[PDB]
Amino acid sequence: MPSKGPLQSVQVFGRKKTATAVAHCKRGNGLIKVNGRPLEMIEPRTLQYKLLEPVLLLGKERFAGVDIRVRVKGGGHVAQIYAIRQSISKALVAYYQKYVDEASKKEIKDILIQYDRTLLVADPRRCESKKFGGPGARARYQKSYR
Amino acid sequence: KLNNLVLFDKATYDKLCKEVPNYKLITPAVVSERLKIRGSLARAALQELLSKGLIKLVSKHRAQVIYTRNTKG
Amino acid sequence: RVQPIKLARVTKVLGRTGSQGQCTQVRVEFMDDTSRSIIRNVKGPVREGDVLTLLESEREARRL
Amino acid sequence: MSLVIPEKFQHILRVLNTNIDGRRKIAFAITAIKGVGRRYAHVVLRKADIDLTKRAGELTEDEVERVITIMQNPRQYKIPDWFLNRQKDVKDGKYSQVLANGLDNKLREDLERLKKIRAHRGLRHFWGLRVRGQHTKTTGRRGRT
Amino acid sequence: GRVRTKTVKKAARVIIEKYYTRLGNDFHTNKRVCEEIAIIPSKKLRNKIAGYVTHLMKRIQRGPVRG
Amino acid sequence: DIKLFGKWSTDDVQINDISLQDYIAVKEKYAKYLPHSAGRYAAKRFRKAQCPIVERLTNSMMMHGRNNGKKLMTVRIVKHAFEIIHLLTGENPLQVLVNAIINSGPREDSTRIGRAGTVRRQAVDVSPLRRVNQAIWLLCTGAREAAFRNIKTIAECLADELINAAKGSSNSYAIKKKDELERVAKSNR
Amino acid sequence: AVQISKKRKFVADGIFKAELNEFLTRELAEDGYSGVEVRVTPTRTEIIILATRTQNV
Amino acid sequence: PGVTVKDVNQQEFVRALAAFLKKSGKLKVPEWVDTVKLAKHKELAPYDENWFYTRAASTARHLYLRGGAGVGSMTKIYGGRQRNGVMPSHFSRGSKSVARRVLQALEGLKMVEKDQDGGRKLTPQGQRDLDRIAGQVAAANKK
Amino acid sequence: TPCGEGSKTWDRFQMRIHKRLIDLHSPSEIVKQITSISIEPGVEVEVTIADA
RNA sequence: CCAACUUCUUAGAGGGACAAGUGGCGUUCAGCCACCCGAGAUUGAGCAAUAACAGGUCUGUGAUGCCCUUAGAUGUCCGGGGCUGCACGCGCGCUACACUGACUGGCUCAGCGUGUGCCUACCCUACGCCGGCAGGCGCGGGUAACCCGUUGAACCCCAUUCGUGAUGGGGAUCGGGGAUUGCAAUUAUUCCCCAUGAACGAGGAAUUCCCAGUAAGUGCGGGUCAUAAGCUUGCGUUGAUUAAG
Ligand SMILES: [Mg+2]
Ligand SMILES: [Mg+2]
């Protein structure tokens, strides 16, 4: 039903080493999930306070006008939860760069930067390939002499 | 020092339910060296003191089951 | 022998020593007057502006 | 519900020739029977319709005798044919699960039968050498002087 | 590990000595100048010339260096 | 305000000894929710100082191959052992760990390549990062050779050794081995 | 016959270029050969020599 | 309100449906169900006694996520780590003719149906009753 | 190494072919004036069937 | 046309960082030290000089000089044996030596890449149905971003069983049986089952490899291939203590 104010919605991602994960954060009422299931029912569950972490220190009721859902492709069990974290870190930032003023973008980015300059900035380091004489990316095979 | 007596005698069980709910670090690897039981009854006896209501659960973890004494406050 | 074991803040890093770079050289100050100083040698990374602890105050200067 | 102990407790049992220890549970105590391993044990205890949880010192001779009977011959009690030890034995043709010292009867019986007709593998058991196609230039040293 | 090679310092002396009045103390201005005025093969040595240019746009604007 | 593992705010922990203030990092700027941070700590030095000690201690716990990449099993050991601390004392468990940094960090240790006073010759002092670096390591190794051929769980044995080192009564290994290095450095002080 | 895959198309015409290079080097050694260039057409196809002496070739 | 399987603890949803098919005894239990070893990459008999029911739950639960998974697609998901001892370990297939029996066990239970291609999807009779007991187990968390 | 002696070197000849794609609805007599317009040895273009 | 669009996928051009800005240094020289902006303020490898070693390879090569051998052939086909034999020593490498573990059952997330032939005949496999496993038959797709295939990998995680025992740790050794490969498995090709259960309880003198996605645990993928990986070469996951001398 495309009637009343459709598609007031930015789509913002987050990557770490393969795991790209994108939030299609619409206008709605307090709904965050990954692939349909809610946040607290996730695979790690020992890291259950670093994938709903930005909704903790920034707010539930401040950030309950949205119907975030995230699909995930790539990565691993530590990669994908930082990826959806980075997805819901900077999506509601970029929801605030456009559909309101930068008074609220300055309000939340200033929290997100001063704590872990890595919630919303991409991870630079990557796989860094093997070499042709050793077992790993730096090491060599064991040298013998006699 | 080995095969230390699964399936309690009567000389240890009357000591167990005397003060093992009383102290606070109630853990299977502690009650199996402070007593002379070899454990996996350490897991068995601890579950039924939780079943009676002498002790309280904290962990519910697979590698570490943590309990405490009764609230005497 | 019986002395209060004393915390101490450094002046400038004066370079490595100890034939392998495993000692540094810090020349601490003894927390009370700014003129009482002794040249010393600690091991561990420095970060100028720290406070290290002296087991005793009268040992040796590093000069042969 | 076993919380202290009953009045009786087989301190060490005695089954056929290998006395199983009384303070393990059943599937891991009867492994000492050379012919009942750890994997063969669980099928015995579940075709007997006994309970798998109890230790060794708390089964009386009613239940043990049904455990002893079906592991004495597993064939006629609905245990499949490619699960046994001496499948298609070369003196009978049948399927004969040996348990006791009879397992050591038929073990040497392979060695002496091959030693009698002078095959290659009969020579390798006779010699102080490996059998199953292993190299011996730089492995298998402490089995010799 | 920073110190720029001679073929940067040789090619960025003839820029500043011959085109002094077309230049100034902003980097992004000078990057388009050498883009247009000297045939540079790739970008990586291009702006590395222009780094020494602005470094000497703040140098010979004060003193008489070999200019 | 930070609720370390969902609980035990970093407000009450008073860093008291002045030699070891700005190298212990449970401070309000540098308190996290739980110790699992994307590191980047050995590209340039001296940013592994303001890293919170809860991060450093859980990283230095998995050592020997079969426990080498396993980080979300070595953090629940810190999550359980802080909780057992609250059983034995009823304390904000961060405060009792930083006293274990205080009471197990050495002061004196010997350095010389060649001929021997003990193996080294010359005892020197310690910068107030290296004795903290040796503080988090002495708690792990002192917990590790008391849980190897022992029925005791490593989460108990961690929780046993550090608060016994935090008081300090020559019972945990981080007191009886640390004072060995200080005494043999006094043998050639 | 029926057609074959793309990664072995590209070593087919690669090994086609390598072989007539080796033959014409042995064939045109005394005439200043200096390589060949191929053109593939779906008609009469088209190859050239780069010979120094266009007499003896 | 509207409750799916997805918003529910799917670890103990397995126990929610292993309790379900055991009590509603229409399921087809094979005769060899205790001499199995379960998918040769592991070397002991299964510790649970009614393991065939809790294996029948997950092959319904995995089928609700992705459609159309045949027998070989469902073998290679229950595979694990085969320790060959002194040689290094590997990954390996499950067992087809225990995955084939259990998918034929839901066949007579009428939760599953064959496909246009090869493979099996679960019929919407299968999705209407496991989400109801997903609603039953969700309200069991709060009570 | 053409022998077995050396110090364990390993060179990596890698070949990377690219590919693009274009549709047509057009009649295919003038498919012949798509083909014969460049001599161009460095292309490998293919003609998809016009049976539709 | 019975919808648009490019954030995520694929690339294509171009833009992007230069030590530019701010301070302290030094001959206000080249530059160094951190800070601010920033995705990033050392991404990692390929190629690589002059002059040489009596380095190795004549068993890659109809590259090759000379010598030797030339039909009772060092040519070459055919069957069998050996290239694998064991009082001993040496070098790479896997598994381990548990409780941070191991079982059993659940929950689970990837990248790199290969695939049917002029010769040479035999590939990737989905599915269906027979087997407690290894497997077997019919039906298909794929010359491939078109099919295998969103590559449901392992570690992990939660759930149970086991408790410091040479034990359910270890699985060498070794018996019997079952299938697949092929012209042939015997001197065990490989795979599977049941049974057997050795040292091994953290390692002498000495020594290697490496400092950021790095060491390492952890699997998958090529290459050799009919059967074939404890090897090698690539891949991703997990992921560090210590160092700036
Ligand atoms: Mg132990
Ligand atoms: Mg040759």
By residue range, what is the domain housing residue F82?
A: 1-189
- Give the DSSP H or E segment for E66: none
Q: CA-to-CA distance for E51 and E27, rounded, in angstroms?
A: 7
Residues of D in contact with H45 (CB under 8 A): 39, 42-43, 46
Chains that touch G (3 or more CB pairs under 8 A): I
Token readout for A46 is 């020992």
Q: CA-to-CA distance for F34 and F3, rounded, in angstroms?
A: 9
SS3 B60: coil
Contacts 24+ apart (CB under 8 A), A91-100: A91/A10, A91/A11, A91/A12, A91/A23, A91/A25, A92/A25, A92/A63, A92/A66, A93/A12, A93/A120, A94/A10, A94/A12, A95/A10, A95/A25, A95/A66, A98/A10, A99/A8
Which among D43, D39, D94 is positioned nearest to D71, based on CA atoms? Answer: D43
State the count of interchain CB pairs (< 8 A) between B and D: 25
- Give the residue ranges of DSSP H helices in chain E: 6-18, 27-37, 43-57
H54 nearest nucleotide via C1' and CA:
J105
Q: CA-to-CA distance for D84 and D43, rounded, in angstroms?
A: 11
Instruction: Write the residue in D5, D21, D58 that is nearest to B8 by C-beta.
Output: D5
Q: Could you give the C-alpha distances from E10 to E14, E16, E17, in angstroms and in order?
A: 7, 11, 11
Q: CA-to-CA distance for B37 and B5, rounded, in angstroms?
A: 5
Q: Residue C45: what residue type?
A: P
* C1' (J36) to CA (A113) span, angstroms: 15
Q: Which residue has the tokens 């659960």?
A: B57
**Domain edges within chain A:** 8-146
F136 touches strand J (CB under 7 A): yes
Q: Which residue has the tokens 């040298």?
A: A143
SS3 D82: helix
D96 touches strand J (CB under 7 A): no
Chains A and I touch (3+ CB pairs under 8 A): yes
Q: Could you give the C-alpha distances from I19 to G40, G41, I25, I39, I43, in angstroms and in order?
A: 18, 19, 21, 19, 10
**Domain edges within chain H:** 1-143
Q: Is B45 on the interface with D (CB under 8 A)?
A: yes
Which among H122, H27, H25, H138 is positioned nearest to H69, based on CA atoms? Answer: H122
Resolution in A: 3.9
SS3 D55: strand
Terminal Cα-to-Cα distance of chain B (whole angstroms): 39
F73 DSSP 8-state letter = T
Total domains in chain F come to: 1
Q: To 5 degrees, how large is the angle CA E36–CA E42–CA E45?
A: 90
Nucleotides of J under 7 A from a protein CB: 7-9, 11-12, 15-21, 29-32, 34, 39-40, 42-47, 55-57, 60-61, 84-111, 114-118, 125-136, 143-145, 149-150, 152-168, 170-178, 186-189, 192-197, 199, 201-202, 208-220, 229-245
Token readout for D133 is 């196609």
Q: Which of residues 5-64 of E touch strand J (CB under 7 A)?
A: 27-28, 31, 43-44, 47-48, 50-52, 54-55, 58-59, 63
Which among H120, H67, H59 is positioned nearest to H94, based on CA atoms? Answer: H59
Q: CA-to-CA distance for E7 and A5, rounded, in angstroms?
A: 61
Please give the radius of gyration of chain F, using alpha carbons only, rounded to the nearest integer: 17
Q: Could you give the C-alpha distances from H68 to A72, H42, H118, H119, in angstroms and in order?
A: 21, 27, 8, 5
Q: Could you give the C-alpha distances from F107 to F123, F131, F142, H122, in angstroms and in order?
A: 10, 7, 18, 69
C-beta atoms of A37 and H7 within 8 A: yes
Which fold does the domain A8-146 belong to in CATH?
Ribosomal Protein S5; domain 2 (3.30.230)
Q: CA-to-CA distance for E55 and E30, rounded, in angstroms?
A: 11
State the smallest CA–CA distance between residue F167 and chain A in angstroms.
31
G4 touches strand J (CB under 7 A): yes
* C1' (J30) to CA (E26) span, angstroms: 22
Q: CA-to-CA distance for A42 and A53, rounded, in angstroms?
A: 13
Contact B8, D5 (CB under 8 A): yes
Residues of A in contact with H9 (CB under 8 A): 41
Q: CA-to-CA distance for G10 and G6, rounded, in angstroms?
A: 7
> Phi/psi at D3 (nearest 5 deg)?
-120, -40
Q: CA-to-CA distance for F115 and F54, rounded, in angstroms?
A: 40
Chains D and G touch (3+ CB pairs under 8 A): no
Torsion of CA D82, D86, D87, D93, to 10 degrees: -160
**Surface-to-core class of residue A23, CB atoms within 10 Å of its CB (0-12 exposed, 13-18 middle, 19+ buried):** buried
For strands A15-16 and C6-10, give the pairing.
unpaired
Which among C42, H18, A81 is positioned nearest to F126, based on CA atoms? Answer: C42
> Phi/psi at G35 (nearest 5 deg)?
85, 170
Give the orientation angle of helix A79-96 with respect to helix A102-114, to 10 degrees: 150
A144 nearest nucleotide via C1' and CA:
J91
> Phi/psi at B26 (nearest 5 deg)?
-100, 110
* DSSP helix, strand, coil percent of chain B (3-state; round to 5): 30, 5, 65
SS3 A31: strand
Which fold does the domain D12-77 belong to in CATH?
Helicase, Ruva Protein; domain 3 (1.10.8)
